[PDB]
Amino acid sequence: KPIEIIGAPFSKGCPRGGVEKGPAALRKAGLVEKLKETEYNVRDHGDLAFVDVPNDSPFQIVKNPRSVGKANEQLAAVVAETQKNGTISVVLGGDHSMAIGSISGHARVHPDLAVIWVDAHTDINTPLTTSSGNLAGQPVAFLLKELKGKFPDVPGFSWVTPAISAKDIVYIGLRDVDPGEHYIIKTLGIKYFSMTEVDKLGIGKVMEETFSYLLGRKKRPIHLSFDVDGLDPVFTPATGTPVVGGLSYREGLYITEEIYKTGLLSGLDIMEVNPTLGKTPEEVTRTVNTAVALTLSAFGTKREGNHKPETDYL
Amino acid sequence: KPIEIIGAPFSKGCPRGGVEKGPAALRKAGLVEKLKETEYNVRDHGDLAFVDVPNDSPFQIVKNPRSVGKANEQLAAVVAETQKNGTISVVLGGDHSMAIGSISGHARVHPDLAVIWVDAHTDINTPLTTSSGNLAGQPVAFLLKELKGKFPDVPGFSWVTPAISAKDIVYIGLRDVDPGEHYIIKTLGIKYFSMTEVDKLGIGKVMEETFSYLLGRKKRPIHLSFDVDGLDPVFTPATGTPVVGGLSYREGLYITEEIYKTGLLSGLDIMEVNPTLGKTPEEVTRTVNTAVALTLSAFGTKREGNHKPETDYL
Amino acid sequence: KPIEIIGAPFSKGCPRGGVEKGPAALRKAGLVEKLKETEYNVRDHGDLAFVDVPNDSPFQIVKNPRSVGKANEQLAAVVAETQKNGTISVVLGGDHSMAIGSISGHARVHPDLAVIWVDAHTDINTPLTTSSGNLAGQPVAFLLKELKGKFPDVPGFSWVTPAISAKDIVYIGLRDVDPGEHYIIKTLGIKYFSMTEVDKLGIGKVMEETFSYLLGRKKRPIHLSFDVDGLDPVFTPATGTPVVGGLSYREGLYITEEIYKTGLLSGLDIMEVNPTLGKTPEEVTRTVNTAVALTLSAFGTKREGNHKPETDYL
Ligand SMILES: NC(=[NH2+])NCCC[C@H](N)C(=O)O
Ligand SMILES: NC(=[NH2+])NCCC[C@H](N)C(=O)O
Ligand SMILES: NC(=[NH2+])NCCC[C@H](N)C(=O)O
Ligand SMILES: [F-]
Numbered sequence: 001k002p003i004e005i006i007g008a009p010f011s012k013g014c015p016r017g018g019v020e021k022g023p024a025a026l027r028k029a030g031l032v033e034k035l036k037e038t039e040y041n042v043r044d045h046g047d048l049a050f051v052d053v054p055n056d057s058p059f060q061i062v063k064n065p066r067s068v069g070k071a072n073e074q075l076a077a078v079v080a081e082t083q084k085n086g087t088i089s090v091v092l093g094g095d096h097s098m099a100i101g102s103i104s105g106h107a108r109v110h111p112d113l114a115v116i117w118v119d120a121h122t123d124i125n126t127p128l129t130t131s132s133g134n135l136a137g138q139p140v141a142f143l144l145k146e147l148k149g150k151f152p153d154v155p156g157f158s159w160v161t162p163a164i165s166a167k168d169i170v171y172i173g174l175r176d177v178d179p180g181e182h183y184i185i186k187t188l189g190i191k192y193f194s195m196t197e198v199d200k201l202g203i204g205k206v207m208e209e210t211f212s213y214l215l216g217r218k219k220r221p222i223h224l225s226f227d228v229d230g231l232d233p234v235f236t237p238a239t240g241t242p243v244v245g246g247l248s249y250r251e252g253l254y255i256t257e258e259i260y261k262t263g264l265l266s267g268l269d270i271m272e273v274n275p276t277l278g279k280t281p282e283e284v285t286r287t288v289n290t291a292v293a294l295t296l297s298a299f300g301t302k303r304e305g306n307h308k309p310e311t312d313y314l
Numbered sequence: 315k316p317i318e319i320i321g322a323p324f325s326k327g328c329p330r331g332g333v334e335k336g337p338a339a340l341r342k343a344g345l346v347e348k349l350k351e352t353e354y355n356v357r358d359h360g361d362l363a364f365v366d367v368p369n370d371s372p373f374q375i376v377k378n379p380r381s382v383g384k385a386n387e388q389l390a391a392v393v394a395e396t397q398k399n400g401t402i403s404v405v406l407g408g409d410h411s412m413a414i415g416s417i418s419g420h421a422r423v424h425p426d427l428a429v430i431w432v433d434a435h436t437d438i439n440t441p442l443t444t445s446s447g448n449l450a451g452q453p454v455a456f457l458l459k460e461l462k463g464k465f466p467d468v469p470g471f472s473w474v475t476p477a478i479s480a481k482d483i484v485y486i487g488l489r490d491v492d493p494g495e496h497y498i499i500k501t502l503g504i505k506y507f508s509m510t511e512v513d514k515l516g517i518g519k520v521m522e523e524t525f526s527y528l529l530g531r532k533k534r535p536i537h538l539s540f541d542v543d544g545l546d547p548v549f550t551p552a553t554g555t556p557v558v559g560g561l562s563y564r565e566g567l568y569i570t571e572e573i574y575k576t577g578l579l580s581g582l583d584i585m586e587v588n589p590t591l592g593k594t595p596e597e598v599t600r601t602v603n604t605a606v607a608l609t610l611s612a613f614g615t616k617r618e619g620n621h622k623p624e625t626d627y628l
Numbered sequence: 629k630p631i632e633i634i635g636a637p638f639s640k641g642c643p644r645g646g647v648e649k650g651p652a653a654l655r656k657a658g659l660v661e662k663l664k665e666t667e668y669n670v671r672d673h674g675d676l677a678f679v680d681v682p683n684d685s686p687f688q689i690v691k692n693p694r695s696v697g698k699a700n701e702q703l704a705a706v707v708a709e710t711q712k713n714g715t716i717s718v719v720l721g722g723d724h725s726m727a728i729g730s731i732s733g734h735a736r737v738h739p740d741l742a743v744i745w746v747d748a749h750t751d752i753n754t755p756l757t758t759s760s761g762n763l764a765g766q767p768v769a770f771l772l773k774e775l776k777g778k779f780p781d782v783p784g785f786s787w788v789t790p791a792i793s794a795k796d797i798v799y800i801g802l803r804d805v806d807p808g809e810h811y812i813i814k815t816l817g818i819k820y821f822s823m824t825e826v827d828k829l830g831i832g833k834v835m836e837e838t839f840s841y842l843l844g845r846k847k848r849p850i851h852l853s854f855d856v857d858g859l860d861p862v863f864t865p866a867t868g869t870p871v872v873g874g875l876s877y878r879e880g881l882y883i884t885e886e887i888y889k890t891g892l893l894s895g896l897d898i899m900e901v902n903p904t905l906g907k908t909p910e911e912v913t914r915t916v917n918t919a920v921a922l923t924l925s926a927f928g929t930k931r932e933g934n935h936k937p938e939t940d941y942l
């Protein structure tokens with residue numbers, strides 16, 4: 001199978017700059033080279049060059065609307081293209097708002113795709129419920145069908161068409177949800193596994209249930225959108241919105257090795273890796289490293305070991 | 315439902331001073347304000363003023379008997395009063411010896427109360443089994459019916475009447491028990507989940523079993539006495555007797571969100587938070603913060619999120 | 629029952645020196661004294677004096693073959709002797725290559741022994757599959773029956789006779805396996821619980837399965853070979869090959885308390901504790917301490933507490 005790396009050095013989704021340097025740190029860590037050592041075919045599409053939209057006034061509270069909107073539209077295009085060539089797309093980016101384009105793109109080629117959202121937050125704040133204008137915290141609100149019309153159209157996001165419905169997404173790791181975000185996920189009956197459920201069930205059963213929920217009836221493509229802050233700050237400190245009591249390094253990898261086994265991984269996002277937020281070079285390294293392991297894992301790397309077929313090592 | 319904060323700045327239960335500053339740190343952390351944002355009605359009773367008993371000679375080994383005794387009698391009174399007004403009592407204190415008064419008080423109004431003791435220690439040392447005279451490690455010995463008469467009456471504790479029996483308490487997190495304390499809990503058939511059981515069952519099944527044990531036949535009130543040292547020093551370092559291999563930040567909260575769901579929380583204690591023991595301001599902050607989260611959790615705060623009823627966020 | 633401490637200050641299995649200082653650190657931590665406080669009879673055999681084999685040229689890639697070979701032959705002898713006196717042997721060593729002699733020795737007296745290998749690595753690299761010549765990573769290749777003849781005889785290891793077969797060993801904690809090592813463990817159908825299985829099952833069920841696998845039909849002696857790097861660097865940082873996402877302090881102890889309950893512990897190894905690798909005195913202390921706890925645990929120490937029989941503490 002084919003893999004296509006696509007860097008999304010974008011940070012306008014969050015007021016904190018830095019996440020744009022994420023792709024670099026990741027490539028710099030040996031991601032592309034390491035990936036190539038897998039049973040996969042790796043191609044690097046390079047980092048997308050996003051044109052800034054001058055005098056990008058804020059829509060009500062929403063910040064950098066047109067700039068985010070345009071960057072995503074370009075991402076959706078790119079991804080939609082690789083998806084058209086049946087290759088698996090990997091978006092290494094900055095803030096999570098790029099999930100808009102990554103999925104909206106993926107959807108154009110695979111409308112029946114399921115989404116497993118690993119994050120500490122729901123990121124489903126509609127532009128009317130946000131306490132800030134940060135779009136990085138609103139991706140899902142833009143991807144949901146059940147949310148269309150519930151909030152005023154935003155400048156730059158007219159190209160977007162709700163790609164999936166409430167019954168096609170599953171959150172994992174939630175532990176920092178707003179009153180509105182919470183109201184919404186409950187009101188729409190969106191399946192989710194907060195840290196409380198993971199504690200109760202254990203990541204083992206957790207993954208078991210998410211697969212039976214999403215792949216119970218039909219077997220469709222999987223879009224894993226991984227926000228590195230789905231794990232505990234002790235594993236991925238270098239991020240804009242760290243939250244205590246998260247997923248462990250182990251559960252993170254367990255999540256990715258399962259999705260690998262389903263043979264249905266179609267698209268992956270590795271977001272929020274900000275190298276400029278590590279209190280120490282060890283923390284940045286630490287973040288980049290596990291974020292790479294998550295990617296490698298998704299694509300076949302196993303903790304029990306891996307070996308090439310037809311090779312008699314004895 | 316009503317909540318009544320009651321500070322117990324007492325430290326005579328342990329030779330280390332500092333736990334008296336605990337209430338401050340907690341209030342100072344925004345506890346009262348944050349609590350008020352819950353579906354509850356919060357009232358702050360302020361910190362109790364404990365009169366020191368001069369020439370408080372030690373009873374055999376027991377230290378500051380009369381001083382502890384009197385402080386508790388005053389606490390039992392206070393608590394017994396709020397309990398009389400059907401409000402939920404919250405004791406923010408110093409050393410755990412105040413559990414004597416918090417429960418003995420709670421009991422006067424709710425004799426059928428169950429007790430979930432989250433701690434790294436059993437704290438059931440009778441004045442005859444203690445290696446030290448520290449009462450902070452003897453609360454339960456004073457609250458048990460099966461332990462009455464087994465040890466010599468102590469000066470200042472004549473007002474106390476065993477509030478509950480061996481079949482009404484459940485320990486969670488035990489991992490540092492003395493030969494005597496152990497002999498006792500085994501001899502009296504006191505249900506408990508040491509860290510070994512939590513490892514085996516997983517906090518999920520652990521909470522499951524404690525509720526079926528305590529609420530199996532009848533549904534009675536719950537008195538959660540939480541020793542912040544039920545968790546690992548990595549989460550609550552600022553405490554007098556830290557012990558490695560404890561409950562995780564996650565398990566602590568899982569414990570409190572369940573007890574919240576039972577709708578039976580009647581009384582809560584948040585003890586052993588000592589701000590003077592943090593090797594660094596981060597450690598003290600760290601302790602105070604999770605101790606607050608435990609409290610907020612107990613009273614409804616959910617990691618999956620919370621939202622107000624009748625509010626259409628869309 | 630009798631316990632016999634045997635120090636194996638050997639480091640030629642790994643290019644990094646330091647693990648030879650391990651026995652010291654452990655004794656220096658109070659191991660022997662603390663052990664004596666158990667229901668066991670402790671005897672210290674002292675640290676073995678290993679004669680260096682001059683001009684010990686490398687066999688192909690294998691480094692210090694003759695030196696390792698000779699040291700092990702001496703260890704096998706020693707252990708085989710205490711085993712003959714029905715006492716339980718405890719090898720406190722340096723690199724894991726000493727597992728060769730510890731088990732080969734144990735085997736001579738108990739050929740039906742089962743082996744529970746707690747380590748982050750399989751250490752089953754045959755001299756033909758190693759990327760380095762480090763024997764510390766090849767112990768099992770020398771102990772397996774199914775591996776005999778699969779690799780060229782090594783200078784100094786002619787005295788060795790495969791002590792156990794693929795169906796007599798169980799790995800726990802694996803998370804850093806080589807292509808060849810992996811090919812081998814899969815090709816030989818060797819039961820193992822990688823960190824992925826532990827995540828899935830939970831150390832509780834994990835221990836459950838390993839006992840039914842190894843003790844299902846017959847009840848034989850247990851040789852627990854514990855490589856401190858089976859746990860996460862956060863617990864045992866001071867080691868030559870640390871790997872993230874390992875066993876927790878808790879799971880390590882849970883592993884040992886179960887093996888204790890089986891009443892079948894016959895032989896134990898506590899390897900890879902390198903005091904010269906702790907970035908800070910706290911890290912070295914931290915490693916030594918949990919390594920001691922693992923040992924004490926193996927021999928009866930319980931987290932729920934322990935008390936002497938026939939002693940009425942009241
Ligand atoms: N980029 C992110 N993942 N941000 C998290 C979004 C949730 C945040 N608490 C908000 O109110 O918007
Ligand atoms: N205040 C406390 N929680 N202390 C713990 C009590 C147990 C202590 N090891 C003792 O011997 O008394
Ligand atoms: N002494 C050890 N435990 N070393 C681990 C052995 C595995 C190592 N990666 C190798 O290739 O040999
Ligand atoms: F994000």
Ligand SMILES: [F-]
Pocket residue numbers: 096119120121122123227
């Ligand atoms: F998020």
Ligand SMILES: [F-]
Pocket residue numbers: 409410411437450451541585586
């Ligand atoms: F306490």
Ligand SMILES: [F-]
Pocket residue numbers: 410433434435436437541543
């Ligand atoms: F305690």
Ligand SMILES: [F-]
Pocket residue numbers: 723724725751764765855899900
């Ligand atoms: F090793």
Ligand SMILES: [F-]
Pocket residue numbers: 724747748749750751855
């Ligand atoms: F190893």
Ligand SMILES: [Mn+2]
Pocket residue numbers: 119120121227229230241272
């Ligand atoms: Mn997030």
Ligand SMILES: [Mn+2]
Pocket residue numbers: 096119120121123136227272
């Ligand atoms: Mn996110």
Ligand SMILES: [Mn+2]
Pocket residue numbers: 433434435541543544555586
């Ligand atoms: Mn305690």
Ligand SMILES: [Mn+2]
Pocket residue numbers: 410433435437450541586
């Ligand atoms: Mn206590």
Ligand SMILES: [Mn+2]
Pocket residue numbers: 747748749855857858869900
């Ligand atoms: Mn190892």
Ligand SMILES: [Mn+2]
Pocket residue numbers: 724747748749751764855900
């Ligand atoms: Mn090893």
